[PDB]
Amino acid sequence: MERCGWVSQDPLYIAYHDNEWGVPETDSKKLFEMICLEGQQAGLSWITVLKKRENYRACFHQFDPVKVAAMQEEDVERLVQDAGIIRHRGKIQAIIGNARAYLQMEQNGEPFADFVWSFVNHQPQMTQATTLSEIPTSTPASDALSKALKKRGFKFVGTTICYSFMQACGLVNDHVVGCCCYPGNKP
Numbered sequence: 001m002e003r004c005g006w007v008s009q010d011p012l013y014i015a016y017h018d019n020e021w022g023v024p025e026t027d028s029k030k031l032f033e034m035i036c037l038e039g040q041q042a043g044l045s046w047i048t049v050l051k052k053r054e055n056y057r058a059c060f061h062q063f064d065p066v067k068v069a070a071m072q073e074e075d076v077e078r079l080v081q082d083a084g085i086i087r088h089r090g091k092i093q094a095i096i097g098n099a100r101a102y103l104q105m106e107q108n109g110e111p112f113a114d115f116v117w118s119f120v121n122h123q124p125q126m127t128q129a130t131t132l133s134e135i136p137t138s139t140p141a142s143d144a145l146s147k148a149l150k151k152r153g154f155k156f157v158g159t160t161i162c163y164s165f166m167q168a169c170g171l172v173n174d175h176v177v178g179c180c181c182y183p184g185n186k187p
C-alpha cells in the first residue's frame with residue numbers, strides 16, 4: 001500500500017504529512033494561520049511556502065492576530081529583509097488586511113471554526129476518490145467557504161484555497177483513499 005504521492009517526494013512533505021494532514025480537529029487560532037499560509041499557494045507551490053512558513057512564523061511568531069492588524073507597511077518593509085522571507089510587500093499587505101477581518105468576526109462573536117465546521121454540518125466528510133486527480137478542488141463546503149471569507153475581506157481564498165484548507169485542517173479525509181490506511185471503513 002502506498003501512502004501519499006507528494007509524500008514520497010521528499011522528507012519535508014513526510015513531516016507535514018505526519019504532523020497533521022487533516023486528522024485532528026482544528027482550533028479557530030490555527031484556522032487563521034492555515035488560511036494565511038494556504039492563501040500564499042496561489043500560483044505558488046505548497047512546498048515553496050512551507051519553507052517560508054518556517055521563516056515567516058519566526059518573524060510573525062506573535063501568534064496574535066490583533067497585533068497583525070497593527071502590523072503596517074513599515075513592518076512589511078523590514079520583514080522582507082527579515083530572514084529574507086518571500087519578499088513581496090504587496091501580498092504581505094494582504095495578510096495585514098486578513099487580520100482586520102479576523103477582528104470583524106470577533107466583533108460579531110463568531111469563531112472561524114464555528115462557521116466552517118458548520119458548513120460541513122459539524123461532521124467529517126469521506127471522499128470516495130482514489131487518486132489525486134480524482135480529488136475534488138471545488139466542493140460545496142469549500143466553495144461556500146471562499147465566498148464567505150471573501151465577504152469578510154479575506155483575500156487569497158481561491159476555490160483551491162478553501163478546499164486545500166479543509167484538506168489539512170481535519171474537516172475532510174481525502175488524501176487519495178487507501179493512503180497506507182485511510183480510516184472510515186469500520187472505525
Ligand SMILES: Cn1cnc(N)c2ncnc1-2
Nearest residue numbers: 006038041046164165168
Ligand atoms: C499538497 N498540499 C498539502 N497541503 C496543503 N495544505 C496544500 N495546499 C495546496 N497543496 C497542498
Ligand SMILES: [Zn+2]
Nearest residue numbers: 003004175179
Ligand atoms: Zn496521506
